[PDB]
Amino acid sequence: HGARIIYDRAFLMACRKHPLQNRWALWFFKNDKSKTWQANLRLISKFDTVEDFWALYNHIQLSSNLMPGCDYSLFKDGIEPMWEDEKNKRGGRWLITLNKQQRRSDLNRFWLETLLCLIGESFDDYSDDVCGAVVNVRAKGDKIAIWTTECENREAVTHIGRVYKERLGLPPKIVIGYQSHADTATKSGSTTKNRFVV
Amino acid sequence: ARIIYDRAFLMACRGGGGENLYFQGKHPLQNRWALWFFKNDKSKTWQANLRLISKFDTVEDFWALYNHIQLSSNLMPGCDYSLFKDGIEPMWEDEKNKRGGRWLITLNKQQRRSDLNRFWLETLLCLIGESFDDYSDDVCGAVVNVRAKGDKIAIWTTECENREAVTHIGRVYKERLGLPPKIVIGYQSHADTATKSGKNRFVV
Ligand SMILES: Oc1cccc(-c2ccccc2)c1
Numbered sequence: 001h002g003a004r005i006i007y008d009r010a011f012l013m014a015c016r017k018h019p020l021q022n023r024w025a026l027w028f029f030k031n032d033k034s035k036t037w038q039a040n041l042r043l044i045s046k047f048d049t050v051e052d053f054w055a056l057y058n059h060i061q062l063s064s065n066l067m068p069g070c071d072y073s074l075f076k077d078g079i080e081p082m083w084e085d086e087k088n089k090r091g092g093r094w095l096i097t098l099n100k101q102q103r104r105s106d107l108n109r110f111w112l113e114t115l116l117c118l119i120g121e122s123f124d125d126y127s128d129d130v131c132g133a134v135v136n137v138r139a140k141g142d143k144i145a146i147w148t149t150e151c152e153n154r155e156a157v158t159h160i161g162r163v164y165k166e167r168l169g170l171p172p173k174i175v176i177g178y179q180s181h182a183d184t185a186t187k188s189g190s191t192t193k194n195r196f197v198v
Numbered sequence: 199a200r201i202i203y204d205r206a207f208l209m210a211c212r213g214g215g216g217e218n219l220y221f222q223g224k225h226p227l228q229n230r231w232a233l234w235f236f237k238n239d240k241s242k243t244w245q246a247n248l249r250l251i252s253k254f255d256t257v258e259d260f261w262a263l264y265n266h267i268q269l270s271s272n273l274m275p276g277c278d279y280s281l282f283k284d285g286i287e288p289m290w291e292d293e294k295n296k297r298g299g300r301w302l303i304t305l306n307k308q309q310r311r312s313d314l315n316r317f318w319l320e321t322l323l324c325l326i327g328e329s330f331d332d333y334s335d336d337v338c339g340a341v342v343n344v345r346a347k348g349d350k351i352a353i354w355t356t357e358c359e360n361r362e363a364v365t366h367i368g369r370v371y372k373e374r375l376g377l378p379p380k381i382v383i384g385y386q387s388h389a390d391t392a393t394k395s396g397k398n399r400f401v402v
């Protein structure tokens with residue numbers, strides 16, 4: 001009693017009410033410059049059970065989901081999906097970049113696997129370091145990221161990265177980078193440096 | 199058997215500093231509970247303004263959260279705190295609230311300093327302590343609305359038509375608040391509260 005509520009992938013998929021450890025908020029953003037950033041960022045919904053997750057997931061999937069210049073974000077209740085939030089400003093993200101061909105084959109499965117890591121508390125005590133996840137749907141290639149709260153907590157960040165990579169099913173040859181938000185916020189060429197790789 | 203704690207027991211577990219030896223030293227609750235907060239920030243939608251603070255399922259974890267948090271008396275008007283059983287949202291259109299209602303007490307502006315904190319704590323101890331015997335299963339949660347015109351504390355129950363459960367909870371709640379017989383609490387269905395018409399099914 002006082003124990004973390006943890007669900008594995010098989011359990012979550014069998015529910016497709018069971019309470020979640022955290023309440024989560026789904027956000028939607030399109031950078032439309034005729035409107036201000038507060039108008040463009042929309043809270044879609046909040047949930048705190050497995051069944052309510054699945055009802056929301058099924059409904060968004062039936063709405064031409066993952067639109068072609070939009071971002072979707074799932075964050076713990078009380079964290080805005082912007083790096084300047086108190087819970088994100090000292091943090092960073094594990095980033096998965098998908099090439100054009102992978103929009104057809106991997107984007108849908110990889111976004112779902114990320115969401116199940118978050119809601120299922122798959123990183124043991126290091127799940128407390130997770131803030132949320134973001135998918136950026138773009139013509140040049142889609143990006144999926146897990147955002148974490150403290151870019152100097154090496155042991156939390158690397159455990160999250162390695163469990164995440166395992167849950168995505170990526171081969172050991174494919175390496176993924178963690179970028180500090182402070183480094184991503186400064187545009188310095190084609191790429192941002194990786195604080196860590198796994 | 200139902201896990202029931204009286205007021206004296208809960209109050210003895212407070213500020214304890216007990217060694218939770220073997221993770222078996224805490225006193226389990228019958229239910230897991232979630233504390234919610236609603237902020238008055240009208241620039242955001244009400245959905246963005248409802249936040250889950252924390253969940254707990256032992257007496258000692260209740261007290262650690264209670265001790266940490268800001269008191270109701272100190273909330274800016276327009277804020278709400280709610281304690282609900284895990285899996286029930288503190289909104290009337292939740293499946294577990296839509297056919298139910300609440301026992302409501304309203305406090306005047308001066309009772310904020312004298313009675314609001316004490317009534318809110320006594321309500322929380324009724325909930326976590328399962329003080330309504332088998333009828334505790336009809337309890338969804340409790341809400342405190344801090345407002346300029348006068349504060350409101352309510353116990354929400356799941357089913358209007360369970361007359362005996364609703365009336366027993368009302369009578370026990372009034373006793374635990376210490377209200378004189380002359381001051382009454384009223385029960386209103388959520389469906390009736392939701393319609394502004396100018397509505398107590400029961401009073402005790
Ligand atoms: O098909 C989609 C596309 C974008 C977001 C989601 C989603 C639904 C519920 C919770 C979290 C994310 C589903």
Ligand SMILES: Oc1cccc(-c2ccccc2)c1
Binds near residue numbers: 233
């Ligand atoms: O001082 C307060 C103010 C508002 C809520 C609470 C609370 C704390 C723990 C469980 C339930 C309610 C305490």
